[PDB]
Structures are given as C-alpha cells and as structure tokens.
Symmetry: C2
Subunit: 221 residues, 2 copies
Amino acid sequence: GSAMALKVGVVGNPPFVFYGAFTGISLDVWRAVAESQKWNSEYVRQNSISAGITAVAEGELDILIGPISVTPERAAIEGITFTQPYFSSGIGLLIPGTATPLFRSVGDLKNKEVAVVRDTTAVDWANFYQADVRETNNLTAAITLLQKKQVEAVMFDRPALIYYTRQNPNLNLEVTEIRVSLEPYGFVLKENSPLQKTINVEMLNLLYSRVIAEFTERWLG
Amino acid sequence: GSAMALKVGVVGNPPFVFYGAFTGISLDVWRAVAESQKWNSEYVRQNSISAGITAVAEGELDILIGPISVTPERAAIEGITFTQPYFSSGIGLLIPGTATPLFRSVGDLKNKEVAVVRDTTAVDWANFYQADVRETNNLTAAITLLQKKQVEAVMFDRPALIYYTRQNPNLNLEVTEIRVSLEPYGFVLKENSPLQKTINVEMLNLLYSRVIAEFTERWLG
C-alpha cells in the first residue's frame, strides 16, 4: 500500500534488537503486527529508552519498540501508554567463572563493583541493592570493564547476557542463577493512540498462538 | 473525601474474589490503588466477565476488577482497554486422585469429558484441545459433576482449583501438573479513560514492590 508510514523508534540489545538494518525478537513481533495490518514502517534507531519515550510523547514517533521494561516510572510519563507486555524477562548478573561462590543472592550485591548500562532498569536495581554502581554507555563497555578487572559483575537483562556468553564461550563468563527482578517488556505508544487497540489485539494473538515463543526460540533456543 | 464514587464491577472466584461484601486478592489490589488516590468505591457484583465488560463499554461501570484473563478476543471489544497485567495465572485441571496417570499432557484432553464454567477462557481452551466440553454455571457446579461421575476433569484457573482442594482435603481431588495455558490477569477500563494512567502506575508500583505477591501469599501461600 502507499499509505503514510508509521515512525518506529528502535532501541535495545540482542537477541531482541540487532543493528545492521534492524532485526531481532522485538522486530519480529513488530513486523508480524505491521504485516497483519498491511502497514508501512520507517525505523529510526533511538539513543536510549527515555529519549525514545520523549519522541513518542512529542509525536516525533508513532511507536517505540524493543525490550522495554514496563516500570511505574515510565508508565507515569505524560503523553505515553504501554502496550500489553509481550515478554517476561529477568534482570541478571554476568560474572567471571571463578566468582560463582560470591554471588548467591541479591544480598551479595552490596558494595560489589557492579557495572550497568546507562538508562536501563539495572541502574535503579543496582542502586536499590546498594552495589557500587558504575554506569557505562553500552553493554559492550560494561563487559569490557569486566573483561579487564574493575567490576565484579555486570547487571543487565538476562536474555541479552546469555546471548552474549553464547557468542564468546572462549571468555568463560557466567550468568548467575540470581534474578534481581522479573520485568515485562512492552512497546510504547502515544496516550490514547488510535493504533493501541489494533496493536494490543495483534500482540496478544502472537502471544497466545505461541508465535512470539517461536521468535524467541529462533534467537535464543 | 466526598467525591463521587467509582462504580466497580466485581467478578471472579477465590482466592481472587470472595462474596460476603467483597474480599480476595483482586480486591486487595484494587483497594490499595483506590486508597493511594483517596478514591471512593461502589462495588457491583457482575454475572459474568463479558457482562461486566459490556457494562464498562456502556459506561455503566468505571472499572471491572477480578481474575480477568487478558485475551485477544476481549482486548478486541469496542470501548474498553485492559490495565497492565497484575498476575500471571495458569489454566489447569482438577481430576480424581486415581485418574493421575490418564492426564499427563494437553493431548490427553481429547474426547475426555471435561467440565468448564461458562464464560471463562477454559471453555475455549477445552474446545481447542478437542475435549468433550460440558458447560456449567459455576465452579461448584463443575466440581459437583466431578464429585459425582460424569466428567473426568474440570478445567479452570489453577489458583482457584488449588484453593478449592485446600478447603476440601477430604475429597481427594488433585490439580494436575498440566498447564493448558498461561494467562495474565488485568482489570478493564473504558477506552481512553482518564483514570488509566493513574491505575497503571499504581498497579505497577504494587507489583514491583512485591505487595501483590504478599496479597497472593496471604490467600494461597
């Protein structure tokens, strides 16, 4: 169709989002939704989740997609609304194989030099657990600090950490059994958006038909 | 305060909803939300979920609370919108203790006389798995049919079934390990409701603070 394209902001990390142009679990979900409605899309990579949320509130974007945790603080932002969640993720920790005995619970996080990526929920969880928080620009930067020896762990979404370890088995890094939290992922629309109902129904259809589970299995099974 | 009360429709079964006047997990969640905003409530028991959803769409109710599964078909109903989910429930099966070997998977459901409560997601799941569906007016009626000997199982939300077995250990009924599905519970508001953002933030606060987990532990821990 020749209808005006929806402006789709993209933010996140593998396996949910990859940057060529754009691929990953989140993109598979959005594309299935867009395709079912014969919609045209224009993808714009966003610097951060909050930058993307502001762009949706300001009408600069029609929707923000990616592994975006639905949190009270974000849901409180004026002008935006979250879609129904499409994935239930856990926030975990990546540590050196030898540090396994040291990280058995969230209580062990206190005072430990924990690396986190700026503008992610991990920053807040790391501060809440009284870790020695060290913010970085990206996951690669946070892991490069662990690869060296400045931080005793990296706090980030569990699926992304697992994916990373699978691309670098040679590194001997391990994702602990510790779950700092369980957070649902959703997309961000403008409040009272006329697309909301259609997107929710479609995402729920994908969820219940186990199609999203297949997408996830393709990138992390 | 003397502000106009919100019309709160109530539907569901224990441990989420009990009928005196109204108590249970769902009522604890709603009350915490209402209390945080100093809101006044007027509770009206609903005959069924779809009856309650229509009452919200028609403006007869401001919100419908209870263990309401967020499904594509319901999200598609004109005039309504679901809040963010507050609980992740599983749909299970209640069978006689002796029938344990017979129910090891959803595939074993085909042709088995399965009892379901009218207007619940179990009706659709039972039909989808090709069981010999037998609709009843309520859970007590569906279980009374199992207590006799007409159905080989009762399909209903797992927490409600477990709660039931705990009030009647003398019956020797068992909730199988089979999970027909995993469904999130949410409340129903009028589409583009001015209360939406406030309710979502509050429910998310309750969720993340583990307060909802405490409510659930009180009625089913």
